Design a binder for this molecule. Sequence first.
Ligand SMILES: NC(=O)c1ccc(S(=O)(=O)N(Cc2ccc(C(F)(F)F)cc2)[C@H]2CNC[C@@H]2NCc2ccc(C(F)(F)F)cc2)cc1
Ligand SMILES: [Cl-]
Ligand SMILES: [Cl-]
Ligand SMILES: [Cl-]
Lengths: 99, 99
Amino acid sequence: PQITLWKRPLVTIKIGGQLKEALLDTGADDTVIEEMSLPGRWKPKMIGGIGGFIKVRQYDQIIIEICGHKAIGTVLVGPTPVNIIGRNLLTQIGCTLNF
Amino acid sequence: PQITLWKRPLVTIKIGGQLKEALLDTGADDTVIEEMSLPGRWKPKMIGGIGGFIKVRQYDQIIIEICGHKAIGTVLVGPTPVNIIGRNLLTQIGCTLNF
Ligand SMILES: NC(=O)c1ccc(S(=O)(=O)N(Cc2ccc(C(F)(F)F)cc2)[C@H]2CNC[C@@H]2NCc2ccc(C(F)(F)F)cc2)cc1
Ligand SMILES: [Cl-]
Ligand SMILES: [Cl-]
Ligand SMILES: [Cl-]
């Protein structure tokens, strides 16, 4: 699809057997999801931006379905105000910016 | 152009006659630039980031060129990790997400 930017580019994703709404975010290096359970090992990480930093759990090799495109990669889990699909997964679905 | 996301989508902007580096950020509603002098009056604005909300200065109808594309619009000034070109100007220059 082609998604314009008049409003936030929210899409439905499937992760850990749950459906969630997430923002396609070219400014985010990493994918960050609200508190949820994921399988496997994790390690702590700090991420930040305007407003400050939050602590998240880093899970690797997690599968996510984004608009019917399956991708695998690292997912950070923590108290983010919005679910964010970052570049590490956007690349995998072939997402580009065009103008 | 078409910009992939394997690295940060950093571009050159021109504002106040000066060249600066900025991030094309579809996850940002607004355009936020590091401290600099802009003309005219400003209004208060609260923007929410990953780690909380902060106050920034809102300037309207500011001339700004983004990757050679001329735009005129709202620019916020405040403590941001990098200069951010958000949806308000991405929309102006005709930028879309595609996959
Ligand atoms: N309203 C508005 O315009 C606005 C809203 C939010 C922000 S934001 O929170 O600062 N912000 C932009 C951002 C840009 C660049 C950087 C930095 F360079 F440091 F990596 C950090 C943050 C948000 C907006 N889009 C990307 C970033 N998302 C939160 C985030 C932060 C860090 C990660 C990580 F590190 F895991 F990848 C993942 C997600 C900026 C502007
Ligand atoms: Cl990854
Ligand atoms: Cl104020
Ligand atoms: Cl604007």
